[PDB]
Coordinates of C-alpha atoms and ligand atoms in Angstrom, one line a residue:
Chain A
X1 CA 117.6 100.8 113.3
X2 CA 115.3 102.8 111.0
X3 CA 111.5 102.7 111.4
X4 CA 110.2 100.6 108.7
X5 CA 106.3 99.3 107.7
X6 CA 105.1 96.5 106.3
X7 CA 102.5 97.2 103.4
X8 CA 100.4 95.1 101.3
X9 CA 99.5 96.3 97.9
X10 CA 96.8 95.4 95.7
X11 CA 97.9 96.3 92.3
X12 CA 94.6 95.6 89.6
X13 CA 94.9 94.9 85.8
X14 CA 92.7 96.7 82.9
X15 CA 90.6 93.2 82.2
X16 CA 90.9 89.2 83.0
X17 CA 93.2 89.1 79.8
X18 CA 95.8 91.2 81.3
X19 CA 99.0 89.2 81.8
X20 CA 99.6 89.0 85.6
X21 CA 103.5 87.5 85.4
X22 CA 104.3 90.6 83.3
X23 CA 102.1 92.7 85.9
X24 CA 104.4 91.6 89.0
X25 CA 107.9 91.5 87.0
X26 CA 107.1 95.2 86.5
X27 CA 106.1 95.7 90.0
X28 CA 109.4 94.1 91.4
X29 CA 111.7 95.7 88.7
X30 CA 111.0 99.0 90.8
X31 CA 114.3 99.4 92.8
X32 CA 114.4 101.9 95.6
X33 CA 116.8 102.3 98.6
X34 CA 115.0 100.9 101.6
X35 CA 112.5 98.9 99.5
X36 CA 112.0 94.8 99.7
X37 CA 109.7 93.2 97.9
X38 CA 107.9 90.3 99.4
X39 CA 105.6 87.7 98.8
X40 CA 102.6 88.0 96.4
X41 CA 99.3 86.3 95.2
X42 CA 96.9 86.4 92.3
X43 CA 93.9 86.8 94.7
X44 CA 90.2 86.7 92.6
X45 CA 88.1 89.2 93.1
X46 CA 85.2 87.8 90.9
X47 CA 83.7 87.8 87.1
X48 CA 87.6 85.8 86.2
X49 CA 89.8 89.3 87.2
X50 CA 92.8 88.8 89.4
X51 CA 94.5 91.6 90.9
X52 CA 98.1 91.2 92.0
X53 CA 98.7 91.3 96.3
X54 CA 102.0 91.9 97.2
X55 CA 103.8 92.9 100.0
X56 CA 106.7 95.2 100.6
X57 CA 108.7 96.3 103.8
X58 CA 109.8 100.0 103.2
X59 CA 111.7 102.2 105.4
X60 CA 109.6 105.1 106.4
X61 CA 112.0 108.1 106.1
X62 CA 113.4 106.3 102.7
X63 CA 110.2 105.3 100.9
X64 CA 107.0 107.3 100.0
X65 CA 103.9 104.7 99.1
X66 CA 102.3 108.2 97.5
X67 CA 105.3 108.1 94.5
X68 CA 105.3 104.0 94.8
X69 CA 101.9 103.7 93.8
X70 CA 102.3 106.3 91.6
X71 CA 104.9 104.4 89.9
X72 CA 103.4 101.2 89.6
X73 CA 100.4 102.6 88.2
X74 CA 102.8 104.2 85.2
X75 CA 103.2 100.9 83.7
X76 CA 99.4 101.8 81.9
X77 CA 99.3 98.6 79.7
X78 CA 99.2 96.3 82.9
X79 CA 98.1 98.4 86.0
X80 CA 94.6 100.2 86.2
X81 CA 95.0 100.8 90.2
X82 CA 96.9 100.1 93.1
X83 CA 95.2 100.4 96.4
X84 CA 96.9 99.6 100.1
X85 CA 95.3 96.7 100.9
X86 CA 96.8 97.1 104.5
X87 CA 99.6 97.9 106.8
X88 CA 101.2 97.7 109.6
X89 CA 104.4 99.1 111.7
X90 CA 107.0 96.8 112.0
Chain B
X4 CA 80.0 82.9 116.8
X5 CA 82.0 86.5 117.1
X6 CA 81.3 90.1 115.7
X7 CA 83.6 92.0 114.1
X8 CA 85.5 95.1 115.7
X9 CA 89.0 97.1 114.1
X10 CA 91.7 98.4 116.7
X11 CA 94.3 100.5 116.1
X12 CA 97.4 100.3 118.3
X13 CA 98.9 103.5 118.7
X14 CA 102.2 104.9 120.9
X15 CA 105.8 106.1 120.9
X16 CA 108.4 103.9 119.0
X17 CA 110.1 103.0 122.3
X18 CA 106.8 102.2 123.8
X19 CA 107.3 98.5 122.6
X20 CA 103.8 98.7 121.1
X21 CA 104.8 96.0 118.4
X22 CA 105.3 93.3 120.9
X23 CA 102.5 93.8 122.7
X24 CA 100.3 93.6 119.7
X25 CA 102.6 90.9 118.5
X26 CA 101.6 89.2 121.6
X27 CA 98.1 88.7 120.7
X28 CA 98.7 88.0 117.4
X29 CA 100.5 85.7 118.0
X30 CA 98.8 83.4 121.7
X31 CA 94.8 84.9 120.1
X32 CA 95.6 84.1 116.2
X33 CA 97.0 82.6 113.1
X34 CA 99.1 85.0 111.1
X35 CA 102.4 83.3 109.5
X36 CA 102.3 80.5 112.0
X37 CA 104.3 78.3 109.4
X38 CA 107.1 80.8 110.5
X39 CA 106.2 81.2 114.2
X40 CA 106.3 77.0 114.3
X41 CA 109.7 77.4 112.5
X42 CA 111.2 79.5 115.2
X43 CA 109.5 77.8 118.1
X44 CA 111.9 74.7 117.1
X45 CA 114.8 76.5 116.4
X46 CA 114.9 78.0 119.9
X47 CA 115.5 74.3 121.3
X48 CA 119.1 75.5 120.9
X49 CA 119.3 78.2 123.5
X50 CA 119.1 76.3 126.2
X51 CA 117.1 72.6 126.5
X52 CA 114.2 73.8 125.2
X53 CA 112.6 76.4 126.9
X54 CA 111.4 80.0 124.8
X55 CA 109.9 83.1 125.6
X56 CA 107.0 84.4 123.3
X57 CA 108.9 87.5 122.7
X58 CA 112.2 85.6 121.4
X59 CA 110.3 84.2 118.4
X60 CA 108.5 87.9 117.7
X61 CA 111.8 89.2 117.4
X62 CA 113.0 86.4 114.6
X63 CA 109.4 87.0 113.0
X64 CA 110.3 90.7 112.5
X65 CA 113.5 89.8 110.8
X66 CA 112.2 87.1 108.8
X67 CA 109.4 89.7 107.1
X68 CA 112.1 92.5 106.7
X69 CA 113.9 89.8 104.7
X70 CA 110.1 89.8 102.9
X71 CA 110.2 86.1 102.8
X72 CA 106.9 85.7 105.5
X73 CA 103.9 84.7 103.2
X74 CA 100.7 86.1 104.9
X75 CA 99.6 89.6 103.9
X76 CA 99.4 92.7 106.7
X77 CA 96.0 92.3 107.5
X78 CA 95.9 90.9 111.0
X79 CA 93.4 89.5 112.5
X80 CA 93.1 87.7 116.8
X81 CA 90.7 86.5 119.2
X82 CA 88.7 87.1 121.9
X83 CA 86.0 85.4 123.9
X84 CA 83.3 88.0 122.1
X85 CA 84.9 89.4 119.1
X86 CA 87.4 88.8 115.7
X87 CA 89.6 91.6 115.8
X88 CA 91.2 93.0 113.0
X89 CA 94.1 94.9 114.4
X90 CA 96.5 97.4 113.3
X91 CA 100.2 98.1 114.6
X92 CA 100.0 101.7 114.1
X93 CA 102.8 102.7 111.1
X94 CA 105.2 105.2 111.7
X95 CA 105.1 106.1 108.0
X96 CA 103.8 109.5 107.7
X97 CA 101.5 108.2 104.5
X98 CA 99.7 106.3 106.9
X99 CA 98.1 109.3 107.9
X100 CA 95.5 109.4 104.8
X101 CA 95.1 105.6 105.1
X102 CA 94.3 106.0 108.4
X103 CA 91.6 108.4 107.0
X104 CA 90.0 107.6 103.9
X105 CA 91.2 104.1 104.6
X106 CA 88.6 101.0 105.1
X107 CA 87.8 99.4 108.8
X108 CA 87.9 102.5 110.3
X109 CA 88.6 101.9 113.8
X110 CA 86.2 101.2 116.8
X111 CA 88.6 101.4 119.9
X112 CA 92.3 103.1 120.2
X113 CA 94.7 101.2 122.4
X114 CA 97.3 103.6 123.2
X115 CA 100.6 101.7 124.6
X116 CA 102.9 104.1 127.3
X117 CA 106.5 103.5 128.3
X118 CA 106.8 103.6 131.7
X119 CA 110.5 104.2 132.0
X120 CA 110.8 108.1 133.4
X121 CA 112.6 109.2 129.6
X122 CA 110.6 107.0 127.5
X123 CA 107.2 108.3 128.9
X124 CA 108.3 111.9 128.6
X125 CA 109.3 111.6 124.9
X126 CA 105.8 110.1 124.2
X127 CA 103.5 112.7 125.5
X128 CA 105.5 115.3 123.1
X129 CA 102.5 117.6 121.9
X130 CA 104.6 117.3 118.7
X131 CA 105.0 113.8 118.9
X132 CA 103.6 111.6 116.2
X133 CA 101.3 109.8 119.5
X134 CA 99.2 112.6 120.4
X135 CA 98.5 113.1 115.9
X136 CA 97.4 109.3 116.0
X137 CA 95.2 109.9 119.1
X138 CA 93.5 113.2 117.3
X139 CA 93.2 111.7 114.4
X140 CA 91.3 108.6 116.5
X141 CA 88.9 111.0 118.7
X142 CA 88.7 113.6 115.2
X143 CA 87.2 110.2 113.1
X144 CA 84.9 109.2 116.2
X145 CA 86.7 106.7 117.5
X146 CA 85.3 107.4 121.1
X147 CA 86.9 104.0 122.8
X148 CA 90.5 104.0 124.1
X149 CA 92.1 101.5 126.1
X150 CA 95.8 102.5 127.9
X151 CA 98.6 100.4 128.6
X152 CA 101.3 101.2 130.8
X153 CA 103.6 98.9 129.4
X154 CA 107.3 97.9 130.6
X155 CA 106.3 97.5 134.0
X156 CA 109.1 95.5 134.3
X157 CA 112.2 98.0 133.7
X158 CA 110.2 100.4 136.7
X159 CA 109.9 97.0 139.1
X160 CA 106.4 96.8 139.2
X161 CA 106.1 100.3 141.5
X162 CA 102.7 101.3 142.3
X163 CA 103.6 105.1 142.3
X164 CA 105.2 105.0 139.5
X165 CA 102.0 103.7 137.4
X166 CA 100.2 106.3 139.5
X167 CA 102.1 109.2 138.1
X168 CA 101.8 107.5 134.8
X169 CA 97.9 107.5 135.2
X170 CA 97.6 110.7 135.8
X171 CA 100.1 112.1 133.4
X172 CA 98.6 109.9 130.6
X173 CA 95.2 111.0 131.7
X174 CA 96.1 114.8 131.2
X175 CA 97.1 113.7 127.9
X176 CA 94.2 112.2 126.6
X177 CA 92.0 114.7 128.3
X178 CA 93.7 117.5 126.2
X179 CA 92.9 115.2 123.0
X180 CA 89.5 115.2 124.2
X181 CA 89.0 111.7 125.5
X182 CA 87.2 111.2 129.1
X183 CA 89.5 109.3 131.3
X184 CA 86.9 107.7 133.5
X185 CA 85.8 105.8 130.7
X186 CA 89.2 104.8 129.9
X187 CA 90.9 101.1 131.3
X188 CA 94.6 101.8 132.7
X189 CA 96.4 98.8 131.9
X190 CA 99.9 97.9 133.8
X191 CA 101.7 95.4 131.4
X192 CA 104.8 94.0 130.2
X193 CA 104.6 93.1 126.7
X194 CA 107.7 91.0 126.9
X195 CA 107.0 88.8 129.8
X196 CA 103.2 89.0 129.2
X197 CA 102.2 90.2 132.6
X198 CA 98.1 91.1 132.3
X199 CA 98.5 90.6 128.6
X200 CA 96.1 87.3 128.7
X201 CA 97.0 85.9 132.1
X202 CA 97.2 88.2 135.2
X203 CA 100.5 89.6 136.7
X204 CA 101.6 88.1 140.1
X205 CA 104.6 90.6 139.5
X206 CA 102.4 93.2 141.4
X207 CA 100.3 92.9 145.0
X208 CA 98.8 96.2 144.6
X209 CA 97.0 95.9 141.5
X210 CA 93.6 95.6 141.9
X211 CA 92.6 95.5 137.9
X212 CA 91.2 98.0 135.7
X213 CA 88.0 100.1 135.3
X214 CA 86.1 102.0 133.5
X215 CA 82.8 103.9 133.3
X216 CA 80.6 102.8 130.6
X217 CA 76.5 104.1 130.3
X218 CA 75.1 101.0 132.3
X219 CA 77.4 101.1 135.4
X220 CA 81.3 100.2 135.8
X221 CA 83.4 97.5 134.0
X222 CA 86.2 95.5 135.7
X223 CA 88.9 93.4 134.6
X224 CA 93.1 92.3 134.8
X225 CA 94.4 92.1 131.7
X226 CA 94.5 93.8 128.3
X227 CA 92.5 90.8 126.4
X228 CA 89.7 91.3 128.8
X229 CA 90.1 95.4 128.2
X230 CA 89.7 94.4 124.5
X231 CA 87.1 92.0 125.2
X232 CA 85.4 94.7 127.3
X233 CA 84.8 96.6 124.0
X234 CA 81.4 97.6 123.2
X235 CA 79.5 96.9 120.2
X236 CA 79.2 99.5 117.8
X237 CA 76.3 99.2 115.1
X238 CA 76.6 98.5 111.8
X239 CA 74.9 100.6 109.1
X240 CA 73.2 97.6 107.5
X241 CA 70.2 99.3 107.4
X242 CA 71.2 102.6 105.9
X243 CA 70.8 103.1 102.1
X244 CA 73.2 101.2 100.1
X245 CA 76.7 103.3 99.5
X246 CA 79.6 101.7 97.8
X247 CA 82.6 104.1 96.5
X248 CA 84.1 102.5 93.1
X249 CA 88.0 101.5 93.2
X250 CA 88.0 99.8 89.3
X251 CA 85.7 99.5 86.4
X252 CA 86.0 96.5 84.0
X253 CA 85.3 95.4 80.5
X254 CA 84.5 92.0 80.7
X255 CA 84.3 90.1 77.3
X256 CA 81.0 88.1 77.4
X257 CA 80.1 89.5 80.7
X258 CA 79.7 93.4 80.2
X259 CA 80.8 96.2 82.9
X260 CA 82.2 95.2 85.9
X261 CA 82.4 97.9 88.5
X262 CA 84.8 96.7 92.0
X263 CA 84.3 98.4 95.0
X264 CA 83.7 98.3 98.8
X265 CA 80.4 98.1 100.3
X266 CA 80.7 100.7 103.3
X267 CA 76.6 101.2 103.7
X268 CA 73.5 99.2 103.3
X269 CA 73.7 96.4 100.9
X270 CA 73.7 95.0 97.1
X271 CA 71.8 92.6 95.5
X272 CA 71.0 91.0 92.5
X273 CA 67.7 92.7 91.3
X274 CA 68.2 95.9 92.5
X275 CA 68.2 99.2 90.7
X276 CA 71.3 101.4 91.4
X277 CA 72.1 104.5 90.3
X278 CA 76.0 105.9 90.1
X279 CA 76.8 109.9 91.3
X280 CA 77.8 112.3 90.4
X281 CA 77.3 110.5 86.4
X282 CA 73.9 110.5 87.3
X283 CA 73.5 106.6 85.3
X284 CA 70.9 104.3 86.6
X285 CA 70.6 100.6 86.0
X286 CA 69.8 96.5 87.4
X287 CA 72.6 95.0 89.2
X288 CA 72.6 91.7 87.1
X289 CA 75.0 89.6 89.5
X290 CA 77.2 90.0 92.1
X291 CA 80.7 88.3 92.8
X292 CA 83.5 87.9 95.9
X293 CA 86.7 85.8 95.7
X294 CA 85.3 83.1 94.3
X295 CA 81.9 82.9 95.7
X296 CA 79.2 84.4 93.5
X297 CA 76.6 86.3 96.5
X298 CA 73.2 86.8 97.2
X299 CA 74.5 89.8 99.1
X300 CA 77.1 91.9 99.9
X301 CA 77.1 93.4 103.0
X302 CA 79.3 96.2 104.8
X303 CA 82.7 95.7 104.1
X304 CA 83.1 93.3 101.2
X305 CA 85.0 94.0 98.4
X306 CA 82.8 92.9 95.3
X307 CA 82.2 93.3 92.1
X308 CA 79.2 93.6 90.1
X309 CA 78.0 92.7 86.0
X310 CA 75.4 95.9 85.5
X311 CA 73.9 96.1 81.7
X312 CA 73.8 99.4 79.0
X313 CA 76.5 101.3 81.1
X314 CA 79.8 101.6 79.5
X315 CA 83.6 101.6 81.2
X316 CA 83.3 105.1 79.9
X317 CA 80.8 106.8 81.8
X318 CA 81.6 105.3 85.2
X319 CA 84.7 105.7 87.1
X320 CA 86.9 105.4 90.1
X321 CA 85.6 107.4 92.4
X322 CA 81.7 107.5 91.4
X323 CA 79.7 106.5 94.3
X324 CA 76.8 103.6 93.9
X325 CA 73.9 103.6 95.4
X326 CA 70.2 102.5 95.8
X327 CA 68.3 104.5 92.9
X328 CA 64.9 103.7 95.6
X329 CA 66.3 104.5 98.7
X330 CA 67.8 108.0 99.2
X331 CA 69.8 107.3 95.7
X332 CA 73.7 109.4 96.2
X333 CA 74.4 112.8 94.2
X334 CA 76.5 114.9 93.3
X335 CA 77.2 118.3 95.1
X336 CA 77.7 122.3 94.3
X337 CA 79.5 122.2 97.8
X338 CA 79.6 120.9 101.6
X339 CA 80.9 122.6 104.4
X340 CA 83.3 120.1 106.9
X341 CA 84.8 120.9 110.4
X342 CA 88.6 120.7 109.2
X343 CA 91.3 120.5 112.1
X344 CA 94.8 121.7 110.7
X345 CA 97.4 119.3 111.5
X346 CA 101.0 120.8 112.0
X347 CA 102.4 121.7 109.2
X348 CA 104.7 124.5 107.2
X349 CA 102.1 126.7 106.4
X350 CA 98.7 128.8 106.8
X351 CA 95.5 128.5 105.1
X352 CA 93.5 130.9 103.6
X353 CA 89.9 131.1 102.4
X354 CA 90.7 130.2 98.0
X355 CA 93.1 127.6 99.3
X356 CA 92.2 124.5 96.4
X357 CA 94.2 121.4 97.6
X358 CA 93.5 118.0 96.6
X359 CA 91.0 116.0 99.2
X360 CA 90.7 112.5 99.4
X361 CA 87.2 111.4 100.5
X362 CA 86.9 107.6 100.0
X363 CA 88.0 106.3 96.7
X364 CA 87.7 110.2 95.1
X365 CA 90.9 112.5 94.9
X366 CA 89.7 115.9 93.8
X367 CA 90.6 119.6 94.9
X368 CA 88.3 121.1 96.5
X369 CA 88.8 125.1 97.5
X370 CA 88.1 126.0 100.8
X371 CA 85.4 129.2 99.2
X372 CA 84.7 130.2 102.6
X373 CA 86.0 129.9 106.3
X374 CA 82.9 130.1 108.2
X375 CA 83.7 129.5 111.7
X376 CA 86.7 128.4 114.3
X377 CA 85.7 126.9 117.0
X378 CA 86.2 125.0 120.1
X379 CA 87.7 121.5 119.0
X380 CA 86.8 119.7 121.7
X381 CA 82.8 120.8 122.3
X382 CA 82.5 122.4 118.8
X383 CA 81.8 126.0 120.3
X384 CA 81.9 128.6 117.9
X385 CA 84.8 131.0 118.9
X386 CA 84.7 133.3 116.1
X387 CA 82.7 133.8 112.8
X388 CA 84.5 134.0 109.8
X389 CA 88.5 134.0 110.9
X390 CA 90.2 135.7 108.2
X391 CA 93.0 132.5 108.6
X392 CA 93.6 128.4 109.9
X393 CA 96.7 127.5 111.5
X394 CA 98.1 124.4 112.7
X395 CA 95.6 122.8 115.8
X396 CA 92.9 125.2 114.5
X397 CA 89.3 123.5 114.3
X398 CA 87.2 125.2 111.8
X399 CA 83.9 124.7 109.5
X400 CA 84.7 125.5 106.1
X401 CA 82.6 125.8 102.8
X402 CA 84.1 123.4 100.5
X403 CA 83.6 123.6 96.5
X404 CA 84.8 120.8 94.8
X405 CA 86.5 121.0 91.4
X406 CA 84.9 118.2 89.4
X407 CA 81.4 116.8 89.8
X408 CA 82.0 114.8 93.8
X409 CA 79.8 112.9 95.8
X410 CA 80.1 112.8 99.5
X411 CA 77.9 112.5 102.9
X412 CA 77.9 114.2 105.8
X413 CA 79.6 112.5 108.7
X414 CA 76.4 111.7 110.4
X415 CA 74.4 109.7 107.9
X416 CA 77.0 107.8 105.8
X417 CA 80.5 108.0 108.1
X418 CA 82.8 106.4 105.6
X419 CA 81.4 108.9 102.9
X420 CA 81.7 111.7 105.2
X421 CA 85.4 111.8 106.4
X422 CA 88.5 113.3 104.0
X423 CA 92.3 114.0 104.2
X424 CA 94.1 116.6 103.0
X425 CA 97.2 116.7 101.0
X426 CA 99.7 119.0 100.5
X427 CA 103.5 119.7 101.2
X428 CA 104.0 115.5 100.6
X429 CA 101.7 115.2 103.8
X430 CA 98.2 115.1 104.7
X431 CA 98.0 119.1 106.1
X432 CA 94.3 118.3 107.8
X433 CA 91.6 116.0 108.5
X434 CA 87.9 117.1 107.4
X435 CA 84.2 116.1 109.1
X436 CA 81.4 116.7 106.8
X437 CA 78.6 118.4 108.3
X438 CA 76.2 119.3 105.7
X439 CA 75.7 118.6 102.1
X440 CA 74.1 120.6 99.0
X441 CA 72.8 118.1 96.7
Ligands
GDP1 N1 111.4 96.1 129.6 C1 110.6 95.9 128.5 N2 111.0 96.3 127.3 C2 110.0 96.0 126.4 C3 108.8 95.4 126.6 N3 108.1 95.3 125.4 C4 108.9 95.8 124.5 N4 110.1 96.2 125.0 C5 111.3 96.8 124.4 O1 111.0 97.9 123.5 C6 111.8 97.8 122.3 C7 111.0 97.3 121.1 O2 109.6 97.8 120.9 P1 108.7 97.3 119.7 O3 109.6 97.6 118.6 O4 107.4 98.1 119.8 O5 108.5 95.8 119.9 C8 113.0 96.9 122.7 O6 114.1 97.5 123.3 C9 112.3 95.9 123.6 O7 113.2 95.1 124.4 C10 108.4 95.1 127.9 O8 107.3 94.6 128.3 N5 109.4 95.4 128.9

């Protein structure tokens, strides 16, 4: 079977008035071959922001984290960031 | 009580590495146990009751490749001395950088053989993605390693054979630049859990592990004990405050929130910090966490912090902030780094301007000068100025960054002081910073 990774992302909004369901629908709209989307929080992170934690299993030769965060972060009315909050091999 | 130490599991993808560090995870912590619990009931149906530890790591797997599991990929287990936050090694080639520029840098290696004769041989490929984990490890200072021999079983226990394996594995790591004496060689079966938290009864001859630490020789039997066996490394708590930005906000009724990661010294409410390379001073009105709202933030928290008359504007990911009365951070003209070239389709050349990434900052920075190649391993200078790098070349270089940066060499501020670098949709080479112009 291919090699695959689990990954956690931290995907934060422009201010605490950003709306975070429309945040994560955009997030999981984002189809790729050898992409699954996982579960996710709205974790604080102080002053009232939320940033959006979700996970994703991608398979290594199929998905490149550089060009996922890259296209998360092109939805520029929701998403200020992403950042890999952590990952693992699977 | 415990302190707080990051491993990084390394090894061959038939080494069976994710079992064994599923293993601990699993008998030393609490990560998706609501799913573990699920499975351990479930397996009441192959036979009357009875499960192996390694039957319900394999439905775990599944069940978060289905991405249904609910806890994140940080992973944390215990020991009798420490919390360890662990990491399963990613084959993912993007893992590189994150292994670089990303936080909890790690503080031992534990590098996981195959001791089948084909497996083992596969693993100890110079080319193989193993021996790039392990010099990235000793390249970032990660000066403990722990080994273990694992599958033990599938080579019936045979003394020789973990011998040969010894020795081999040795060579290996010596080539890195590790110093096997002061290395633990583990026999193990990840599967069956032989010296994994109990000792193996599977094998006579085994006396335990050793190693050769400053203040005599450490013994032991299993892999927890190994782990256990760690030493302390110290914290920079009392180094000046350094903490990379990852987000600024605009807080209505609150004013600018910067969010970053407190890598050095510490924040507190009253203090005067000043952001590089903007050059903006000002008082740190409050600082928050999750939920909490702190009287500190120390080394490694995440936090954000309300600071007045600074606007979204002119501070940014990237900026660096500091203590303004206690060697405050600044920019730089340059800084010259010992860079090791990774493999890679290509040859470097001094006016080479790829992007670096050195903590939250991604700027290109032109290599201006090649000043030396030297030794990797004891940092001997072999030549001065070599007119080119190639791949396993170890080199200083003169680096001038294209937009106002602020970094640290390695030796003061560590997680200010380490960079990857991109190119060719891979990180190309892995920079030390060794001294700074202000
Ligand atoms: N014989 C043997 N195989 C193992 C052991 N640990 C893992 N494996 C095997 O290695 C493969 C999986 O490795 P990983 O994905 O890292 O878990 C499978 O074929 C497993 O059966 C062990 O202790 N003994």
């Amino acid at each position: 079977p291919a090699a695959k990774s689990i990954v956690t992302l931290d995907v934060k909004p422009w201010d605490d008035e950003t709306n975070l369901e429309e945040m994560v629908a955009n997030v999981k709209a984002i189809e790729m071959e050898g992409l699954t989307w996982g579960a996710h929080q709205f974790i604080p992170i102080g002053f009232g922001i939320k940033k959006l934690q979700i996970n994703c299993v991608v398979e290594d030769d199929k998905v490149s984290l550089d060009d996922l965060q890259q296209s998360i972060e092109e939805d520029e009315d929701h998403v200020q960031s992403t950042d890999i909050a952590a990952m693992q091999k699977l | 009580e415990k302190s707080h130490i990051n491993v990084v599991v390394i090894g061959h993808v038939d080494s069976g590495k994710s079992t064994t560090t599923g293993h601990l995870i699993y008998k030393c912590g609490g990560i998706d146990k609501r799913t573990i619990e699920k499975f351990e009931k479930e397996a009441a149906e192959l036979g009357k009751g009875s499960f192996k530890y390694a039957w319900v790591l394999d439905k775990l797997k599944a069940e978060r490749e289905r991405g249904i599991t609910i806890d994140i990929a940080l992973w944390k287990f215990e020991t009798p001395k420490y919390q360890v936050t662990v990491i399963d090694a990613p084959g993912h080639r993007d893992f590189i950088k994150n292994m670089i520029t990303g936080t909890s840098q790690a503080d031992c290696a534990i590098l996981i053989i195959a001791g089948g004769v084909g497996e083992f041989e596969a693993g100890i490929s110079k080319d193989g993605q193993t021996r790039e984990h392990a010099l990235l490890a000793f390249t970032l200072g990660v000066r403990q390693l722990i080994v273990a021999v694992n599958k033990m079983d599938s080579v019936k226990w045979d003394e020789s054979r973990f011998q040969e394996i010894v020795k081999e594995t040795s060579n290996f790591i010596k080539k890195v630049g590790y110093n096997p004496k002061t290395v633990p060689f583990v026999p193990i079966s990840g599967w069956n859990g032989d010296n994994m938290i109990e000792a193996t009864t599977n094998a006579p001859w085994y006396k335990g592990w050793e190693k050769e630490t400053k203040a005599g020789v450490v013994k032991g039997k299993t892999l927890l004990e190994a782990i256990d066996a760690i030493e302390q490394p110290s914290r920079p708590t009392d180094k000046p405050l350094r903490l990379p930005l990852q987000d600024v906000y605009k807080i209505g009724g609150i004013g600018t929130v910067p969010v970053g990661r407190v890598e050095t010294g510490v924040i507190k409410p009253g203090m005067v910090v000043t952001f590089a390379p903007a050059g903006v001073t000002t008082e740190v009105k409050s600082v928050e966490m999750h939920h909490e709202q702190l009287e500190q933030g120390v080394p490694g928290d995440n936090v954000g912090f309300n600071v007045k008359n600074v606007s979204v504007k002119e501070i940014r990911r990237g900026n660096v902030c500091g203590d303004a009365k206690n060697d405050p951070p600044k920019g730089c003209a340059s800084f010259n780094a010992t860079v090791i070239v990774l493999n890679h389709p290509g040859q470097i050349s001094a006016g080479y301007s790829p992007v670096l990434d050195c903590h939250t900052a991604h700027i290109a920075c032109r290599f201006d000068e090649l000043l030396e190649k030297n030794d990797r391993r004891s940092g001997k200078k072999l030549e001065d100025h070599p007119k080119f790098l190639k791949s396993g070349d170890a080199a200083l270089v003169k680096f001038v960054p294209s937009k106002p940066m602020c970094v640290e060499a390695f030796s003061e501020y560590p997680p200010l002081g380490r960079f990857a670098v991109r190119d060719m949709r891979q990180t190309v080479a892995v920079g030390v910073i060794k001294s700074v112009d202000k």
